[PDB]
Design a binder for this molecule. Sequence first.
Ligand SMILES: *[B@@]1([O])OC2=C(C([O])=O)[C]=[C][C]=C2[C][C]1[N]C(=O)[C]1[C][C][C][C][C]1
Length: 261
Amino acid sequence: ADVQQKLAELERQSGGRLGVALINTADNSQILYRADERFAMCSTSKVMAAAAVLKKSESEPNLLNQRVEIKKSDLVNYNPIAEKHVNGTMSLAELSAAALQYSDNVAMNKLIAHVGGPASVTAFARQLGDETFRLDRTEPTLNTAIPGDPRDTTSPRAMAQTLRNLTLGKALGDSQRAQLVTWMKGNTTGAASIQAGLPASWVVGDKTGSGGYGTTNDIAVIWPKDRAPLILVTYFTQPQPKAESRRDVLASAAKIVTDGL
Ligand SMILES: *[B@@]1([O])OC2=C(C([O])=O)[C]=[C][C]=C2[C][C]1[N]C(=O)[C]1[C][C][C][C][C]1
């Protein structure tokens, strides 16, 4: 109850809406705050798309080495890796890493397309028992994050449970799980978010997200020092369409829910 009040006060000062889901796998205890409300996933959805490709590769062993053409007309708003490979190709492995570790939007679009479109990424979540996740649009419009819009949303509880199944559970084959975890542990975008609220000695694999209405997200699997692993989802969105990102809010939330662990 103390943590709930701290998160409520953090939220008040932030001026936005905060969603938190922490799963402690030591005993399956949880800290939940607006955990059943819907939030625009933004780029945190790229974990689901990469996972669906990994699942597909479980029956197509050389799948991750297949080449995908990168076209100039594919470039959108944020293409840090794909812009370097225009007029060439990238493997699905490289596209998965680019989406997860640099939040490349072209890579996400290639991941979505390869599994049949957003409805197939959603079908994958259903296959995992996730009835809340829904992916409706491609990059970049899936990040609009309009209040009241259910497109491209999920709840902190649903994503925390699915991330547990993906990174610590049996959603993926163990070889594919290891690749997903390795990729997420190599993320370059998360130093100011969840990671920033945890001790430096803790190992973090995370995927961040940014969108309209100042939406600022992060989902992580965490191996604390001398503790069982944790799953943490911190979603944050704001009332103003042009609101600025608040990664500091996610760091504060992580510090609050891990205080005293
Ligand atoms: B995605 O949300 O991830 C992302 C991030 C991040 O990881 O927080 C940072 C910068 C760009 C991206 C690409 C994805 N978000 C968007 O494309 C979004 C950026 C702000 C305006 C609306 C589109």
